[PDB]
Amino acid sequence: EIVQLLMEHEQTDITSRDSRGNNILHALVTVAEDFKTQNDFVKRMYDMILLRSGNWELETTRNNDGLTPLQLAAKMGKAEILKYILSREIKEKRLRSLSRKFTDWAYGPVSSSLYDLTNVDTTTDNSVLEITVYNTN
Amino acid sequence: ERIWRLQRARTILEFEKMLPEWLRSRFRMGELCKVAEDDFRLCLRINEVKWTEWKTHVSFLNEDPGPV
Amino acid sequence: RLKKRIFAAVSEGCVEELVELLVELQELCRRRHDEDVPDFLMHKLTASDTGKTCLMKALLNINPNTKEIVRILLAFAEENDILGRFINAEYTEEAYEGQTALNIAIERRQGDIAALLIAAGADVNAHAKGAFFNPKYQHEGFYFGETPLALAACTNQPEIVQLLMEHEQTDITSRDSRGNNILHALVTVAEDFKTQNDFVKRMYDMILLRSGNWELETTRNNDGLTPLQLAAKMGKAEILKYILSREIKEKRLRSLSRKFTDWAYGPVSSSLYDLTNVDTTTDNSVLEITVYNTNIDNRHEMLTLEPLHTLLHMKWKKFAKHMFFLSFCFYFFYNITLTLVSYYRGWLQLLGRMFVLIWAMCISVKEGIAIFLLSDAWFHFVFFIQAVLVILSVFLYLFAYKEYLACLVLAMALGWANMLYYTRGFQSMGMYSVMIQKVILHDVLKFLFVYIVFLLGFGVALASLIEKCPKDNKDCSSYGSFSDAVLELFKLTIGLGDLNIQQNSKYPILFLFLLITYVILTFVLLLNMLIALMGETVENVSKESERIWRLQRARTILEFEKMLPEWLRSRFRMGELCKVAEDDFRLCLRINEVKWTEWKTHVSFLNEDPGPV
């Protein structure tokens, strides 16, 4: 409720980067320990905050470490939040762009889902897959 | 298995790092798709069969449901 | 211009008013034409590229106001007398051929629109015969028997199935391009319980009770199979359990049942299963189909069904036990005569050689027929190798060759190893032998490959250290030849060798170090094969052993039944003839059951007097 109130207020800046560089979504990624511990509220607030701002700005920002929240949820061992991010089927036709999982055709039980590979494939530097594989921490 | 598949991923990415740019561009996985009007992006196609949840498919890109 | 406007207004459906004005503009355009008005109106209202109509586009793209849009489209078509030619149109595309608006509305769970279209003169027998609907690969399409009815049945839409069945024009016996009727399609679409939640069984029951006839289960597809045989060839177990066990309560539809209770006095009840196309009397029966295919990997769930299981037990109790023991005795005497010959190598020898040459030809012919007809068949290959070696040895014995004896014992030593085959009879020994087979296939070869490469790696090393010559004494030169060194290492892993510091080498310390490392690596390798064995066997060799053993037993039982002649089959023909319903006499199988949990009044029963007679 307070998040709705803070977001509704005009003076609020959702893109506010703190001293560490982390915006709100980075912070939620740092605070996403597990399911058995938290009962999975961080995922819902990620969805809420990102749908209240229909833009790619927040997931596009890089912290002072040089990482998007997608890359941070991989460098840090946050799996539920990453499963949410990499698999998104948004129903609202207005906010269809923010999705990363798309169903280009389904005739019945069959459905061909269409995932996205912008910063996941190894084309870009320090992608998600390199981050997952090349760390033992 | 959890260590084996992980070593395999490491080796696969190592060999992909060994290659030159043009063979990467040849073996570049994924297909370019128009997800939404004015957006063209790389994507990966995965076919799924689900019997438990029935619904009307409102959200979909291609009107003609088939491979092309 | 106009056409794109119509299709876009139908897809988006922002308002039916801008559709009404647009259709009025199209009426104004059409009023100019005197004749050929329907054809032009369709061509302007239909996409000629794919054969897609505005009604189909409106249906594909669902929105809350679609019912109104559809009504508007239908009333317009009725006004200009194109309704029948308008609804029943279909794609000219190669992949989407036959797809109509009705299949689309059924694909998207629209019950009211389907009723409106059927009432408006829609073709309910529209066959969607295309590459998408009749694919080669499962990921590229969706097969549902190529009809609206079967589509509604497979997608769990029972109200529409009732509507399609109630309509007079509908043909339930409609065979598609593949030959499959609706029940065949339901059999192809019955993956499992955990995946589907068991709706296909209910729709099978519904559709077969709505048509009180044997027609549907009697039809054969172009592959030459009834749905009963197809649910067995394909690995569909829930649907088959339903079919083979049917207790219908309705006295009118009693004939369609296959499970009958001829008497029950209380918890006791003698159920009476049916054996028309299940027993091996008819060609390609259910039981042959279940047993003689490896493609399924579900055959344990298939054969634990009741009539098949009891048939196999009865066929064992009657004749297959005796034939198995008999073949065991023949092979026993055969290999014992072979051993007497090999140990004592004229009259008894000649007679034994004659009997061996006689029986080996029989085994060779059986193995050749079995291989031509074709890890379950390894035994046949090994028997064939044995018979080949034996006949070669008996051939070479007449001539003055020396290598006959090498051909002899290598069969004999193999022959006893084949007696493991006949350990399949005993349950304990059968599971034991199948465990030997699975272990020698899975785990031991891993150990042996690593051990062999370690032998061939350390042996050349230890031999190279002995590059110094024997210097007038071969006994000083141990590990000299590569073969001798490998042999000493094979001694050493067991405990037979003689570990010792070498005197003929230049670096005895390195020799000893390599040899100790060899021992330790062999030890840890043994330890790890033991680990992986213990890890994989739990819940595998306890279950999969029996699941393979009973399956081999079913295969052998049916093999021996195939060996017999017609008259002994007619003698041992299991089952008793019974009158299930007035004018029906059929083979059946009697199974007595005792059930205490469910109490009820036994209304449905054949014999009034509840007792054996």
UniProtKB/Swiss-Prot annotation, chain A:
Q: Which domain of life is it from?
A: Eukaryota
**Tissue expression notes:** Abundantly expressed in CNS. Widely expressed at low levels. Detected in dorsal root ganglion (at protein level). Expressed in the keratinocyte layers of the outer root sheath and, to lesser extent, to the matrix of the hair follicles (at protein level).
Each ANK repeat, start to end: 23-55, 65-87, 123-137
Localisation: Cell membrane; Cytoplasm; Lysosome
What disease does the Swiss-Prot or TrEMBL record associate with this chain?
Olmsted syndrome 1: An autosomal dominant, rare congenital disorder characterized by bilateral mutilating palmoplantar keratoderma and periorificial keratotic plaques with severe itching at all lesions. Diffuse alopecia, constriction of digits, and onychodystrophy have also been reported. Infections and squamous cell carcinomas can arise on the keratotic areas. The digital constriction may progress to autoamputation of fingers and toes.
Q: Which function does this protein serve?
A: Non-selective calcium permeant cation channel. It is activated by innocuous (warm) temperatures and shows an increased response at noxious temperatures greater than 39 degrees Celsius. Activation exhibits an outward rectification. The channel pore can dilate to provide permeability to larger cations. May associate with TRPV1 and may modulate its activity. Is a negative regulator of hair growth and cycling: TRPV3-coupled signaling suppresses keratinocyte proliferation in hair follicles and induces apoptosis and premature hair follicle regression (catagen).
Instruction: Summarize subunit and interaction data from the UniProt record for this chain.
Output: Homotetramer. May convert from a homotetramer to a homopentamer to allow pore dilation. Interacts with TRPV1; may form a heteromeric channel with TRPV1. Interacts with SNX11; this interaction promotes TRPV3 trafficking from the cell membrane to lysosome for degradation.
In the record, the note on similarity to other proteins reads:
Belongs to the transient receptor (TC 1.A.4) family. TrpV subfamily. TRPV3 sub-subfamily.
Put simply, this protein is called: Transient receptor potential cation channel subfamily V member 3
Swiss-Prot record, chain B:
Which family, according to UniProt?
Belongs to the transient receptor (TC 1.A.4) family. TrpV subfamily. TRPV3 sub-subfamily.
Give the encoding gene's name.
Answer: TRPV3
Describe the subunit structure: Homotetramer. May convert from a homotetramer to a homopentamer to allow pore dilation. Interacts with TRPV1; may form a heteromeric channel with TRPV1. Interacts with SNX11; this interaction promotes TRPV3 trafficking from the cell membrane to lysosome for degradation.
Q: Where in the cell is it found?
A: Cell membrane; Cytoplasm; Lysosome
Q: Which domain of life is it from?
A: Eukaryota
In the record, the effect of residue 4 to G is given as:
In OLMS1; gain of function mutation; results in constitutive channel activation
The lineage, from the top, is: Eukaryota, Metazoa, Chordata, Craniata, Vertebrata
Per the UniProt topology annotation, the Cytoplasmic ranges are: 1-68
Name the source organism. Homo sapiens
Q: In which tissues is it expressed?
A: Abundantly expressed in CNS. Widely expressed at low levels. Detected in dorsal root ganglion (at protein level). Expressed in the keratinocyte layers of the outer root sheath and, to lesser extent, to the matrix of the hair follicles (at protein level).
The entry's protein name is Transient receptor potential cation channel subfamily V member 3
Q: Which residues of the whole protein are included?
A: 689 to 756 of 790
> What clinical condition is it connected to?
Olmsted syndrome 1: An autosomal dominant, rare congenital disorder characterized by bilateral mutilating palmoplantar keratoderma and periorificial keratotic plaques with severe itching at all lesions. Diffuse alopecia, constriction of digits, and onychodystrophy have also been reported. Infections and squamous cell carcinomas can arise on the keratotic areas. The digital constriction may progress to autoamputation of fingers and toes.
